[PDB]
Amino acid sequence: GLVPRGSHMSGATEACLPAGQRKSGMNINFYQYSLKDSSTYSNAAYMAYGYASKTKLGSVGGQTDISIDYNIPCVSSSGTFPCPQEDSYGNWGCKGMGACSNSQGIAYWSTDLFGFYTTPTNVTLEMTGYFLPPQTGSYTFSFATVDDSAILSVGGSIAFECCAQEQPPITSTNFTINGIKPWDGSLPDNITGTVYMYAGYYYPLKVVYSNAVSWGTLPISVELPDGTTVSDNFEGYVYSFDDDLSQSNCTIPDPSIH
Numbered sequence: 001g002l003v004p005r006g007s008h009m010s011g012a013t014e015a016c017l018p019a020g021q022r023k024s025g026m027n028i029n030f031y032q033y034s035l036k037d038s039s040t041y042s043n044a045a046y047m048a049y050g051y052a053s054k055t056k057l058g059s060v061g062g063q064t065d066i067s068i069d070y071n072i073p074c075v076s077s078s079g080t081f082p083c084p085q086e087d088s089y090g091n092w093g094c095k096g097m098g099a100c101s102n103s104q105g106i107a108y109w110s111t112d113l114f115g116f117y118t119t120p121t122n123v124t125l126e127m128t129g130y131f132l133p134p135q136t137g138s139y140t141f142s143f144a145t146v147d148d149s150a151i152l153s154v155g156g157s158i159a160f161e162c163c164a165q166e167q168p169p170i171t172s173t174n175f176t177i178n179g180i181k182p183w184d185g186s187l188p189d190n191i192t193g194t195v196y197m198y199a200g201y202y203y204p205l206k207v208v209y210s211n212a213v214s215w216g217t218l219p220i221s222v223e224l225p226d227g228t229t230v231s232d233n234f235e236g237y238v239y240s241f242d243d244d245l246s247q248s249n250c251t252i253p254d255p256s257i258h
């Protein structure tokens with residue numbers, strides 16, 4: 001046939017072609033989240049957009065290394081050092097450091113999250129940008145684990161609106177990865193999600209992540225169509241554009257026939 005038929009029942013993911021100046025990396029916004037609040041982050045509305053109704057703490061731009069690996073301090077006999085969670089023991093010590101005198105249950109201040117000084121123990125963050133596939137095919141995004149709650153969304157009208165990266169969050173709960181902390185306990189059902197992407201189109205990407213206490217962990221990866229995996233460092237794949245709500249042609253509803 002002269003032309004491709006298109007994905008069935010307009011099933012292609014919406015993408016974008018922003019015409020402005022591209023910037024490397026994602027924007028990270030930080031919002032207040034209460035220490036030891038084990039319920040707010042279990043609501044889909046909160047993780048999709050309600051986080052932005054809490055106080056905005058600040059932001060950092062241009063971030064390409066997007067995984068989270070926050071370790072609380074151990075105040076030890078030889079000084080204060082971050083403790084890998086698997087090395088914590090007893091009530092409590094950190095392997096190779098002895099007993100720790102400090103509480104696992106208080107807020108801690110650090111620049112560990114993207115250089116931004118905040119409380120990684122208790123915070124919500126929103127990562128936004130556009131994913132640029134170099135290859136047409138199936139991409140599988142993953143979280144290796146989630147501590148405490150997280151979502152990943154891909155696509156125009158799902159992550160955010162084309163050419164409108166900096167706007168308040170949209171209300172879609174059609175997450176690509178639903179890593180929301182269950183009300184009962186541990187292990188959302190599925191922490192991978194696959195998206196079919198066409199090379200050279202910009203796909204809106206949003207990650208919302210929350211920690212309520214102590215350790216924070218979100219190892220982000222993507223499996224490319226060629227079978228290789230990109231983990232943590234998304235340089236060359238993720239970009240930002242300043243809003244341009246005037247760019248009439250920015251939205252590509254069906255990259256399968258554009």
Ligand SMILES: OC[C@H]1O[C@H](O[C@H]2[C@@H](O)[C@H](O)[C@@H](CO)O[C@@H]2O)[C@@H](O)[C@@H](O)[C@@H]1O
Pocket residue numbers: 036104105106147148212213214215216
């Ligand atoms: O899954 C909840 C929480 O579990 C673990 O935190 C422990 C401790 O560090 C906290 O102070 C108390 C607060 O009541 O909870 C647990 O005993 C960690 O895996 C933590 O990261 C996680 O959020």
Ligand SMILES: [Ca+2]
Pocket residue numbers: 156157161
């Ligand atoms: Ca829309």
Ligand SMILES: [Ca+2]
Pocket residue numbers: 147148211212213214215216
């Ligand atoms: Ca935690």
Ligand SMILES: [Cl-]
Pocket residue numbers: 093094095096097098099
């Ligand atoms: Cl020890």
Ligand code: NA
Pocket residue numbers: 069070071084085215217
């Ligand atoms: Na860790």
Ligand code: NA
Pocket residue numbers: 072073074080081082083
């Ligand atoms: Na430390």
